[PDB]
Structure formats: C-alpha cells, structure tokens
From a paper:
From our 1.8 Å resolution structure of the [name]–[name] complex, we find that the [name] molecule binds poorly to the protein, with only one of the four active sites (chain C) represented in the asymmetric unit displaying electron density sufficient to build in a [name] model.
Tankyrase enzymes are now appreciated to poly(ADP-ribosyl)ate (PARsylate) a number of target proteins which contain a common RXXPXG ARC-binding consensus sequence. Both TNKS and [name] bind to and suppress Axin2, a negative regulator of β-catenin, suggesting that they may represent novel druggable targets for cancers dependent on active β-catenin.
Numbering used by the authors: 962 to 1160
The structure:
Amino acid sequence: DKEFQSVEEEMQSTVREHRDGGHAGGIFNRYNILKIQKVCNKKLWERYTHRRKEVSEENHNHANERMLFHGSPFVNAIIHKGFDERHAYIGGMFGAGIYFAENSSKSNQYVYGIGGGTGCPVHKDRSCYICHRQLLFCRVTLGKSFLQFSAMKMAHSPPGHHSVTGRPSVNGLALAEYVIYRGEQAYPEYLITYQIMRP
Ligand SMILES: O=C1NCCc2c(OCCCCN3CCCCC3)cccc21
Ligand SMILES: [Zn+2]
C-alpha cells in the first residue's frame, strides 16, 4: 500500500550522519525495511484521542500533532500497554519525559538501550547488520510546545505547556527531539521491523 510506502520514505529520508560516527546506532546510510505493521489498539487509541482533544482545547483548538519516531528495547510493552511516563526518570537532557525524533537514525540509537547499550542480544554489536531491529513511528500530541536549546531537567511539562521541543544549538543538540511527560500524548501507530544496511 501507499500508506506503508509513505512510512518507508519517512524512515529512509530522515537518516542523518551522526556526530558519534555511528557508535550508538551503527554505521549506515539506509535501512532494509522488512515489515511495517499498523498497530490497532482501541483502548490506547481512545486514551490518545481523549487527551488530544483536551490538549487541543488548551492550545487555541490545535493539537499540534506530529508523526515522530521512537526507539526502545521495550517496543512490545509499548504496543500493548502504551507509553508510560512512570518508566521515565530525570536523567535525560529534558528530564523525566518520553523522547521522540523527527530523524529515524536518531531513534535507531536507542533501540538497544541508552547510547545503543551493548547492541544486539545475539552478537553484542551496536552496528549489527544481521539482527532485525524495531522502531515505532508514532502519533504525538505536542500541544503548546516549550522551545529549549540547553539542558532543562523537568519532571513535567513547563507551566501552560504540553511538551518540550529540543532545538539544535552550538554545544548543543545536533538534531531536534520532542519530549512529552504524559504517556497518553503518544500513540504507537506503526511498528517497523528493519535492518541497518552496510554502506
Ligand atoms: O526514540 C527515542 N527513545 C528514547 C530516547 C530518545 C532521545 O533522548 C535520549 C534521552 C535520554 C533519556 N531517555 C529516557 C529513558 C531511557 C531512554 C533514554 C531523543 C530522541 C528520541 C529518543
Ligand atoms: Zn546481531
């Protein structure tokens, strides 16, 4: 379908060269997309749309929804139980939030853990070309998003806001990131199974 070709194009076209030279996510310019599955979880969808309507009413009738990537070793728990801020802690650049990227390759750096962890479970390789990885392409309600350049360890959204947008700066994020502090503000719409490809 064209819906899945659209997802594959967003996955491929948003790849960037990383500052760490591929340390966290592996060395690649493109992916081998194996499968794209649409997640249909009615209870999670309703939790998401209920919150989306509330945020829209608090943001000049505008949800400020975006399709963003999310990488995690816990993709299976997310598709069944949803995103959960109780699993977030203060240690990230913007604190105890749930993080998303507009660049698929940035989300790919988190699939095997923080900084890629020890890589794939079978080969302990962050640049594994063999093992199949999974990323989520998500509907995310940003609402009134607080723009920030430097570290600001939050527990919750800033007063009057619904999310934080980390913008690139000198010393300094290389790429944007989007952070929510309520799990119901994202819906894991597509589950993408893929491999990174050797350049
Ligand atoms: O796709 C993403 N997944 C999570 C991390 C992430 C980014 O932020 C790194 C911030 C460190 C704190 N995180 C929360 C708890 C454990 C994982 C790391 C930025 C953009 C996308 C993502
Ligand atoms: Zn492997």
